[PDB]
Amino acid sequence: PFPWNKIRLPEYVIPVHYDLLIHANLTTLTFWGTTKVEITASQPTSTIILHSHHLQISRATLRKGLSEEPLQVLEHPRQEQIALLAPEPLLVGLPYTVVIHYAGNLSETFHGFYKSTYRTKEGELRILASTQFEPTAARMAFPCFDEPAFKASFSIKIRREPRHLAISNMPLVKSVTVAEGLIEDHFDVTVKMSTYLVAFIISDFESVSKITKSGVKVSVYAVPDKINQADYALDAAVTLLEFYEDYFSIPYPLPKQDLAAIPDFQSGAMENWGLTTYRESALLFDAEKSSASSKLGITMTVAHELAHQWFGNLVTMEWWNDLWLNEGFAKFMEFVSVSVTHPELKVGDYFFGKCFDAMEVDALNSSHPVSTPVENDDVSYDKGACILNMLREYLSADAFKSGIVQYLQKHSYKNTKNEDLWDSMASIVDVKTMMNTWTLQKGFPLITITVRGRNVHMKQEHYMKTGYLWHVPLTFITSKSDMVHRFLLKTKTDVLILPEEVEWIKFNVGMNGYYIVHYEDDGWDSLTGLLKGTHTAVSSNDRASLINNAFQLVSIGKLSIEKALDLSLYLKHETEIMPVFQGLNELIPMYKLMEKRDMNEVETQFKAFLIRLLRDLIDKQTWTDEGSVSERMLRSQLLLLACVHNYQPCVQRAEGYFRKWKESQIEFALCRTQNIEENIGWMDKNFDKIRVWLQS
Ligand SMILES: *[C@@H]1O[C@H](CO)[C@@H](O[C@@H]2O[C@H](CO)[C@@H](O[C@H]3O[C@H](CO[C@@H]4O[C@H](CO)[C@@H](O)[C@H](O)[C@@H]4O)[C@@H](O)[C@H](O)[C@@H]3O)[C@H](O)[C@H]2NC(C)=O)[C@H](O)[C@H]1NC(C)=O
Numbered sequence: 075p076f077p078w079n080k081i082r083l084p085e086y087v088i089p090v091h092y093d094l095l096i097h098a099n100l101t102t103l104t105f106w107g108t109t110k111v112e113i114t115a116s117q118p119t120s121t122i123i124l125h126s127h128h129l130q131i132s133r134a135t136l137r138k139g140l141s142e143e144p145l146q147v148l149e150h151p152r153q154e155q156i157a158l159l160a161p162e163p164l165l166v167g168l169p170y171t172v173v174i175h176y177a178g179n180l181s182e183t184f185h186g187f188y189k190s191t192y193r194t195k196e197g198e199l200r201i202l203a204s205t206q207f208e209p210t211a212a213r214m215a216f217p218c219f220d221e222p223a224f225k226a227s228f229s230i231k232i233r234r235e236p237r238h239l240a241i242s243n244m245p246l247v248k249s250v251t252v253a254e255g256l257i258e259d260h261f262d263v264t265v266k267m268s269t270y271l272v273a274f275i276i277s278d279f280e281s282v283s284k285i286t287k288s289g290v291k292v293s294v295y296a297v298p299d300k301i302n303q304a305d306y307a308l309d310a311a312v313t314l315l316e317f318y319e320d321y322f323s324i325p326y327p328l329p330k331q332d333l334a335a336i337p338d339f340q341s342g343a344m345e346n347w348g349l350t351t352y353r354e355s356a357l358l359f360d361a362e363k364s365s366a367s368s369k370l371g372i373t374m375t376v377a378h379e380l381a382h383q384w385f386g387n388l389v390t391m392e393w394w395n396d397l398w399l400n401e402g403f404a405k406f407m408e409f410v411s412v413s414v415t416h417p418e419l420k421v422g423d424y425f426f427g428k429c430f431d432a433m434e435v436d437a438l439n440s441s442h443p444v445s446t447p448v449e450n451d452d453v454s455y456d457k458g459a460c461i462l463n464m465l466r467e468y469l470s471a472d473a474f475k476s477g478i479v480q481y482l483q484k485h486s487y488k489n490t491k492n493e494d495l496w497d498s499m500a501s502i503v504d505v506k507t508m509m510n511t512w513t514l515q516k517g518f519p520l521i522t523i524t525v526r527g528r529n530v531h532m533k534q535e536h537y538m539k540t541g542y543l544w545h546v547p548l549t550f551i552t553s554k555s556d557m558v559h560r561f562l563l564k565t566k567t568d569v570l571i572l573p574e575e576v577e578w579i580k581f582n583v584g585m586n587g588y589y590i591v592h593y594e595d596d597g598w599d600s601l602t603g604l605l606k607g608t609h610t611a612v613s614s615n616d617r618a619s620l621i622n623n624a625f626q627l628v629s630i631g632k633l634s635i636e637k638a639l640d641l642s643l644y645l646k647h648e649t650e651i652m653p654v655f656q657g658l659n660e661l662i663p664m665y666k667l668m669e670k671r672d673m674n675e676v677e678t679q680f681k682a683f684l685i686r687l688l689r690d691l692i693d694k695q696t697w698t699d700e701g702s703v704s705e706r707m708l709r710s711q712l713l714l715l716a717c718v719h720n721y722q723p724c725v726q727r728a729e730g731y732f733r734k735w736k737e738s739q740i741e742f743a744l745c746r747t748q749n750i751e752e753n754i755g756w757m758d759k760n761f762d763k764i765r766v767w768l769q770s
């Protein structure tokens with residue numbers, strides 16, 4: 075009558091160190107294991123519960139001192155648990171060692187300890203064994219207390235044919251012959267760590283290596299054919315590793331960082347401590363058959379997995395309910411690190427895009443708070459990255475840097491709740507109470523700004539396409555100073571006084587805050603006038619912020635379409651990628667609707683306007699398949715936009731390129747050839763006004 079019935083393991087028995095021996099046969103796809111887990115009870119008990127999944131356990135025994143009683147083994151496979159029953163109850167404080175011998179088949183499902191395969195350039199098929207334990211698949215490789223807060227140290231021993239090479243979290247300490255044609259690799263004992271980060275690969279990979287200034291041996295491992303494709307990742311890893319050491323003010327905790335390009339990898343990449351694993355796409359760069367657009371994905375993934383080597387692995391979440399923070403921060407560090415290490419890649423453009431996308435989904439009533447209870451690549455992580463960025467810009471960058479450093483130093487090799495980050499952050503503003511508003515309640519606020527002279531009035535309310543209330547960390551700038559000012563809106567309304575009256579004031583500086591800002595009275599006109607007059611006054615992101623917001627407000631009926639379209643008219647002058655994309659994302663769907671309706675003579679004037687608006691930009695765009703990794707996407711979209719739209723210099727050079735390709739994607743071109751209640755309302759309110767507008 076299985077003696078435990080909670081999903082979570084009992085907290086009164088704690089592992090301290092594991093001795094893992096894994097002998098895995100890659101020919102017969104079978105592995106045998108012995109697991110010695112040293113433990114202590116904080117409370118008397120004759121029952122040890124631990125996790126095990128698809129493992130045939132032969133014998134299990136409990137050592138103390140020096141005795142050695144056998145243990146009765148009970149299985150509850152549906153809960154992925156097993157119980158060990160001890161003849162006598164364990165004494166509190168006394169160390170005991172549990173030894174479990176077991177066998178298992180390598181998984182075919184790309185989870186746990188699994189078989190992956192690859193055909194070499196010279197035809198032969200070769201097998202490799204690899205791990206993926208996040209979140210709960212270490213229990214498929216060896217029985218354990220497989221929850222991330224039961225941290226312990228791992229001595230891993232892998233047995234393989236001389237044919238093969240074994241790598242794991244720590245460096246190889248010694249290789250010894252344990253039998254006829256059986257080598258035993260002895261890996262150095264890990265620092266205290268979580269079970270889900272434990273990794274080992276049994277393979278035939280070759281590799282390349284580079285030392286960091288710090289003295290850390292960084293290596294990328296790949297199948298022998300593609301190991302020449304690893305040079306980019308390696309150089310990136312070292313730079314980022316060096317960057318993070320500096321940022322976190324904590325040396326890389328382990329002695330070596332290995333990156334591995336696992337062939338049939340079904341996750342994207344995993345942050346196994348000391349042995350990060352990636353899909354080949356995400357790490358290797360083929361000089362021929364892959365675009366310079368791949369390099370973004372490699373750098374950013376490395377950035378993410380390396381970030382975890384401190385934030386996630388050195389300091390781990392107590393439970394999966396704070397996975398959002400872990401990943402949010404990794405994602406956020408992608409943006410922070412790469413923008414400094416590989417500035418030429420232009421990660422900024424990618425980041426805010428995803429924040430916008432997060433907002434689009436977060437505005438829907440279906441949305442869920444970021445911080446959910448869990449009792450067992452995603453937008454919640456994206457949101458987490460945004461709110462983290464919002465926080466960082468509110469405090470200084472340096473303040474935020476200090477908070478992370480203190481946090482990491484304080485909780486090293488321990489676990490934490492998300493509140494612990496906010497507490498660290500709040501001691502380098504009630505950060506805890508603030509961030510709770512953003513993590514415990516869904517969506518985000520509309521900030522309504524009303525100016526009377528020097529008195530700047532702030533209202534907040536939940537934005538919806540509830541009685542919700544945030545601690546909004548507002549930042550703003552005025553016509554007077556380019557200096558960023560801060561105001562913490564803890565209440566539904568508040569006011570702040572300026573020293574002197576201003577022509578315009580702009581909230582949500584650099585688009586960094588997870589919220590939208592509306593301006594009552596002539597405030598939008600002030601800002602419309604600012605952009606028309608001198609648009610570089612505010613940043614590119616500010617402009618994008620204004621256009622997005624402007625048109626988004628038109629949707630919820632707090633702004634007349636004309637006022638938004640009037641703002642759009644600034645785009646004549648716009649050079650940068652982020653605003654134009656916002657212009658297009660909001661203007662394009664307008665005419666796409668108008669096509670479906672048979673009042674298609676205004677359609678034509680709209681398209682004329684759209685093309686006349688972007689005309690100047692359409693020209694300056696030179697016809698290469700190569701530039702700033704997103705700037706390419708601008709070229710692509712602009713050129714496509716210009717034709718179908720029958721721009722004359724599109725169809726002057728555009729078909730001259732087609733006759734040059736006549737001398738010696740394909741669905742798109744072969745289709746764009748000339749051979750509902752939300753809508754009904756939109757056009758019902760918006761058609762006439764847009765016509766009356768266009769006319770002028
Ligand atoms: C996975 O399981 C497989 C079987 O299902 C294993 O395979 C077999 O592995 C053995 C050795 O690992 C291999 O037999 C070898 O036998 C020779 C051993 O060498 C010695 O040399 C001297 C000869 O004068 C003497 O000391 C003694 O007689 C002995 O012969 C070796 O030299 C040969 O080259 C030969 O390879 C079998 O061939 C393998 N069988 C098959 C079908 O491949 C495999 O090792 C397992 N791997 C793991 C990790 O468990």
Ligand SMILES: [Zn+2]
Nearest residue numbers: 345382401404
């Ligand atoms: Zn991650």
